[PDB]
């Protein structure tokens, strides 16, 4: 079933976007944690 | 070429592991940032 792959690829994309979202997120949230006082 | 897929899957795995590594990392590093004084 090629479908699986089709998803494996689509997911991969959404993944990379996530990784950057995680760091960026934890980066923004954390950064604020500082001035959060 | 099925090779591509073979990689798309392998990567996916390493990916999920990363996502958890990012959060966990930024979680451990950040957590320390607190007691880091």
Curated annotation (Swiss-Prot), chains A, B:
Which family does this protein fall into? Belongs to the protein kinase superfamily. Tyr protein kinase family. CSF-1/PDGF receptor subfamily.
Q: Any transmembrane segments, and where?
A: 7-27
Subcellular localization(s) per the UniProt record: Cell junction; Endoplasmic reticulum; Cell membrane
What is the recorded function of this protein according to its Swiss-Prot or TrEMBL entry? Answer: Tyrosine-protein kinase that acts as a cell-surface receptor for VEGFA, VEGFC and VEGFD. Plays an essential role in the regulation of angiogenesis, vascular development, vascular permeability, and embryonic hematopoiesis. Promotes proliferation, survival, migration and differentiation of endothelial cells. Promotes reorganization of the actin cytoskeleton. Isoforms lacking a transmembrane domain, such as isoform 2 and isoform 3, may function as decoy receptors for VEGFA, VEGFC and/or VEGFD.
Q: Which domain of life is it from?
A: Eukaryota
Q: What is known of its domains?
A: The second and third Ig-like C2-type (immunoglobulin-like) domains are sufficient for VEGFC binding.
Q: Which stretch of the full sequence is covered here?
A: 759 to 795 of 1356
> This protein is called what?
Vascular endothelial growth factor receptor 2
Entry comment on modification after translation: N-glycosylated. Ubiquitinated. Tyrosine phosphorylation of the receptor promotes its poly-ubiquitination, leading to its degradation via the proteasome or lysosomal proteases.
């Amino acid at each position: 079933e090629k479908t699986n792959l089709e998803i494996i690829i689509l997911v991969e994309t959404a993944v990379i976007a996530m990784e950057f979202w995680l760091l960026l997120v934890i980066i923004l949230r954390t950064v604020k944690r500082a001035n959060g006082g």
